[PDB]
């Protein structure tokens, strides 16, 4: 199913480019790991790497341009209305085409940005979240699963 992964600050002001406001009543916390706040804490990246391991990643063009090189050993799927500008990754012109390009896999990872997260959140089954404190440090990694009726 579809999963989102994101890093969220505690007192965030949510506009269009941000991870959406999600309804806590609709999400079950299934894993929570708290840790010491450390500057440039290396575990932040390791968390992303572990959780995206060997899964297709979908991202919007802005996010693609902020990263700039393909995440290795992952099909990298970039959403853009325009023809692609990097032959190392897969380019698609709609959400449906992005899902289609992933094939039959156990899990699809959406890695941002705000416009892309907003379109995929309503179809998502899991969230992988890094919670960030008032001076920009992670303090907790969390996995949530969507609550079904
Ligand atoms: N909290 C987190 O962990 C996290 C993670 C990653 C990124 N981010 C933030 O997200 C920011 C980017 O957010 P963003 O909203 O500006 O951009 P974004 O979602 O990365 O990219 C938006 C671009 O993707 C393409 N796109 C999106 N939906 C589409 C659709 N349905 N059909 C076709 N193309 C589509 C469009 O590209 P064209 O203009 O080419 O048509 C659009 O301009 C970054 O600056 C970063 O700071 C946060
Ligand atoms: Cl939600």
Residue numbers in the entry: 1 to 149
Quote the study that presented this structure, word for word.
DHFR (EC 1.5.1.3) is a ubiquitous enzyme that utilizes the reduced form of nicotinamide adenine dinucleotide phosphate (NADPH) to catalyze the reduction of 7,8-dihydrofolate (DHF) to 5,6,7,8-tetrahydrofolate22. DHFR is an essential enzyme, and a clinically relevant drug target that is inhibited by the antibacterial compounds trimethoprim and methotrexate. Here, we examine whether it is possible to rearrange a protein structure with newly introduced amino and carboxyl groups. This process can be described as “protein rethreading”, where instead of threading the protein according to its linear sequence, the polypeptide chain makes alternate connections at suitable junctions that may be available in its three dimensional (3D) structure. For the rethreading process, we selected dihydrofolate reductase from Escherichia coli (wtDHFR), which has been shown to tolerate a variety of circular permutations.
We determined the structure of rDHFR-1 to 1.60 Å. The space group was identified to be C2221, and two molecules were found in the asymmetric unit. All new loops made the designed connections and the rethreaded protein maintained the overall core structure of the native protein, except for the sites of the alternate loops, as expected. After structural alignment with the wtDHFR, an RMSD of 0.88 Å over 116 residues was obtained for Cα atoms. Interestingly, no NADPH was added to the crystallization trials, and the NADPH observed in the structure is apparently a result of co-purification. A part of the NADPH binding site in the B molecule was observed to be involved in crystal contacts and thus this site was not available for binding NADPH. Although, the exact reason for the loss of activity is not determined, the movement of the NADPH, and specifically the motion of nicotinic ring is a likely cause. Additionally, rDHFR-1 did not show reducing activity towards dihydrofolate (DHF).
